[PDB]
Amino acid sequence: DHSLEAQWTKWKAMHNRLYGMNEEGWRRAVWEKNMKMIELHNQEYREGKHSFTMAMNAFGDMTSEEFRQVMNGLQNRKPRKGKVFQEPLFYEAPRSVDWREKGYVTPVKNQGQCGSSWAFSATGALEGQMFRKTGRLISLSEQNLVDCSGPEGNEGCNGGLMDYAFQYVQDNGGLDSEESYPYEATEESCKYNPKYSVANDAGFVDIPKQEKALMKAVATVGPISVAIDAGHESFLFYKEGIYFEPDCSSEDMDHGVLVVGYGFESNKYWLVKNSWGEEWGMGGYVKMAKDRRNHCGIASAASYPTV
């Protein structure tokens, strides 16, 4: 009715959308299907069938093809070439951890029209380690990785891996700050300048494919880089609460993110920092189901750098 037409017009304006005559038609269809599922889902939430709610956002008119192109960023083959993390049995991890309260985490960033989640997950873990080492929080450059880690196996906006990113930092002897090497969301020439370098003696460690191990690692090291299966509109439109997708895969992770802590609702979850801006989820964060048989592959390809 008039309400639907009005809401569509408002969303378009709000997100500054200008479509051609033919596109307008199918973009709206995409948007309406999403609005319908968000509605049905939220009703089921009220009925207690879900732990999280959904809400329309800037990705309301996006196609699955476009999603795979700019929202993700992880490569198919995920090799384990880093040092090994041995789960300490005689260490008892706390019930909850949140590194943002310790000042290990920088503000939420936005990868934009570039499938570079690998770069954001990488700098995220590095920023925490540098803070653990200097007590100084400096935002690192994702653009540096995008433009320079090609030899390490990365493909800029076409995907890469966090380990390849950590490898680059090793071989290179440093990574610039975001202030000196701004994010452009595209592949340009490598402008790495030593004058603004940080993390000169790096390396990386891979964590076993177990949540118990991942938990002990987060509690003792700081934020950790993890890969998750994010290809679901439930995640795309996630709003708040504990995210749980029955159709989530524990083996096909396409999105790189950062775990900054874990806890339980006073029911356990992982505090995850995403790079889709503050307008997504909980200020750019998502509480993901913990200890639910490696939900979304959270513990299948986790690692952290060493400085």
UniProtKB/Swiss-Prot annotation:
PTMs per UniProt: During export along the endocytic pathway, pro-CTSL undergoes several proteolytic cleavages to generate the CTSL single-chain and two-chain mature forms, composed of a heavy chain linked to a light chain by disulfide bonds. Autocleavage; produces the single-chain CTSL after cleavage of the propeptide. The cleavage can be intermolecular.
Binding sites annotated in the UniProt record for Zn(2+) 3: 163, 206
Record-listed Zn(2+) 6 binding positions: 252
GO biological process: adaptive immune response; antigen processing and presentation; antigen processing and presentation of exogenous peptide antigen via MHC class II; antigen processing and presentation of peptide antigen; CD4-positive, alpha-beta T cell lineage commitment; cellular response to thyroid hormone stimulus; collagen catabolic process; elastin catabolic process
Predominant location category: other
Quaternary structure and partners: Dimer of a heavy and a light chain linked by disulfide bonds. Interacts with Long isoform of CD74/Ii chain; the interaction stabilizes the conformation of mature CTSL.
Record function comment: Thiol protease important for the overall degradation of proteins in lysosomes. Plays a critical for normal cellular functions such as general protein turnover, antigen processing and bone remodeling. Involved in the solubilization of cross-linked TG/thyroglobulin and in the subsequent release of thyroid hormone thyroxine (T4) by limited proteolysis of TG/thyroglobulin in the thyroid follicle lumen. In neuroendocrine chromaffin cells secretory vesicles, catalyzes the prohormone proenkephalin processing to the active enkephalin peptide neurotransmitter. (Microbial infection) In cells lacking TMPRSS2 expression, facilitates human coronaviruses SARS-CoV and SARS-CoV-2 infections via a slow acid-activated route with the proteolysis of coronavirus spike (S) glycoproteins in lysosome for entry into host cell. Proteolysis within lysosomes is sufficient to activate membrane fusion by coronaviruses SARS-CoV and EMC (HCoV-EMC) S as well as Zaire ebolavirus glycoproteins.
Residue positions binding Zn(2+) 2: 142, 178
Record text on activity regulation: Inhibited by the propeptide produced by autocleavage. Long isoform of CD74/Ii chain stabilizes the conformation of mature CTSL by binding to its active site and serving as a chaperone to help maintain a pool of mature enzyme in endocytic compartments and extracellular space of APCs. IFNG enhances the conversion into the CTSL mature and active form. Inhibited by CST6. Inhibited by the glycopeptide antibiotic teicoplanin. Inhibited by amantadine.
Protein species of origin: Homo sapiens (Human)
Chain sites annotated for binding Zn(2+) 1: 101
Proregion positions: 1-92
Reactions the enzyme catalyzes: Specificity close to that of papain. As compared to cathepsin B, cathepsin L exhibits higher activity toward protein substrates, but has little activity on Z-Arg-Arg-NHMec, and no peptidyl-dipeptidase activity
Binding-site residues for Zn(2+) 4, renumbered to this chain: 184, 188
S-S bridge residues: 114-157, 148-190, 248-296
Family: Belongs to the peptidase C1 family.
Membrane topology term: Peripheral membrane protein
Record-annotated site: Cleavage: 85-87, 91-93
Protein name in UniProt: Procathepsin L
Recorded GO MF terms: collagen binding; cysteine-type endopeptidase activity; cysteine-type peptidase activity; fibronectin binding; histone binding; proteoglycan binding; serpin family protein binding
GO CC field: apical plasma membrane; chromaffin granule; collagen-containing extracellular matrix; endocytic vesicle lumen; endolysosome lumen; extracellular exosome; extracellular region; extracellular space
Binding site for Zn(2+) 7: 254
